[PDB]
Amino acid sequence: DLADRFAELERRYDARLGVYVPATGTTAAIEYRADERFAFCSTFKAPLVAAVLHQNPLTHLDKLITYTSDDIRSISPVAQQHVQTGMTIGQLCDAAIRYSDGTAANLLLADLGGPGGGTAAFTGYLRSLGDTVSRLDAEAPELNRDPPGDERDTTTPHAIALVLQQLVLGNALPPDKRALLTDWMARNTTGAKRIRAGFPADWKVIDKTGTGDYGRANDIAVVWSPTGVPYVVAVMSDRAGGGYDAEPREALLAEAATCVAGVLA
Numbered sequence: 001d002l003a004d005r006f007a008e009l010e011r012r013y014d015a016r017l018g019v020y021v022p023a024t025g026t027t028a029a030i031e032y033r034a035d036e037r038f039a040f041c042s043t044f045k046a047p048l049v050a051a052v053l054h055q056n057p058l059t060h061l062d063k064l065i066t067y068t069s070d071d072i073r074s075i076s077p078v079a080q081q082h083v084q085t086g087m088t089i090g091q092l093c094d095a096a097i098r099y100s101d102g103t104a105a106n107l108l109l110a111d112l113g114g115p116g117g118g119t120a121a122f123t124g125y126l127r128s129l130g131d132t133v134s135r136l137d138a139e140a141p142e143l144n145r146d147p148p149g150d151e152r153d154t155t156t157p158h159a160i161a162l163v164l165q166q167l168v169l170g171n172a173l174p175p176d177k178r179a180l181l182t183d184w185m186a187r188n189t190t191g192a193k194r195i196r197a198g199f200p201a202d203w204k205v206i207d208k209t210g211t212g213d214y215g216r217a218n219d220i221a222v223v224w225s226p227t228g229v230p231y232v233v234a235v236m237s238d239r240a241g242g243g244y245d246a247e248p249r250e251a252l253l254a255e256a257a258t259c260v261a262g263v264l265a
């Protein structure tokens with residue numbers, strides 16, 4: 001029994017786990033704590049890139065953005081290396097998705113513009129996709145730090161799955177922009193030990209991870225069966241019982257995904 005297996009994993013990792021897989025074709029939706037709020041952490045960077053792509057002509061990707069020492073305020077594997085030269089919008093999108101670069105995401109928020117350094121426009125983009133649940137209130141590093149239960153900077157496995165479905169599988173973006181977002185998530189470097197780890201090699205996986213304080217570990221993915229049948233998989237977790245410094249536990253996500261993959265096979 002699936003709910004029993006997820007609850008077993010919660011006890012194993014002293015965690016709260018949320019899972020959603022939308023209904024499609026002949027599979028019922030898979031849901032576990034799917035309507036409970038979890039911190040976005042870096043998972044927001046996927047719809048952020050979509051927002052930026054949607055808002056501008058495709059060749060806005062070629063615009064050079066400059067930034068300085070005081071803009072590096074969070075884990076930023078790429079932006080720290082290019083600080084002397086700047087990064088184009090396309091480079092920033094690439095880094096935000098593939099390396100979960102915090103500075104890149106902060107600069108992309110500013111590019112979107114408006115109140116809250118872009119967080120309000122980001123939230124408005126989600127509302128345009130019918131997501132009345134999610135909210136972004138802060139940028140990096142603050143967005144990963146809200147106390148357990150606080151609704152700031154949260155989504156739900158249900159809400160973010162439906163957003164990702166529209167972005168990758170549906171028609172939220174035109175095909176060319178859709179393909180850019182899909183390819184960056186396909187080439188993600190941070191996700192090998194999460195949803196990817198729970199699906200057989202002959203299934204295609206694209207994803208965006210998130211990791212935060214209070215043992216937060218998330219992953220949102222689109223997977224394709226060996227016959228090209230796609231599914232959206234959202235797994236979110238925290239370990240609030242260990243306090244602020246609780247270790248995120250990727251293995252929880254790998255195990256949850258293995259259970260999901262068993263049902264979808």
Ligand SMILES: *C(=O)[C@@H](NC(=O)[C@H](N)c1ccc(O)cc1)[C@@H]1N[C@@H](C(=O)O)C(C)(C)S1
Pocket residue numbers: 041042043074075099100101102141144190208209210211212213248
């Ligand atoms: C978004 O989730 C980002 N999270 C980190 O910036 C955050 N400071 C943090 C990282 C790791 C911890 O143990 C605690 C807080 C980036 N996205 C993450 C991811 O998995 O995608 C990282 C790649 C770790 S950093």
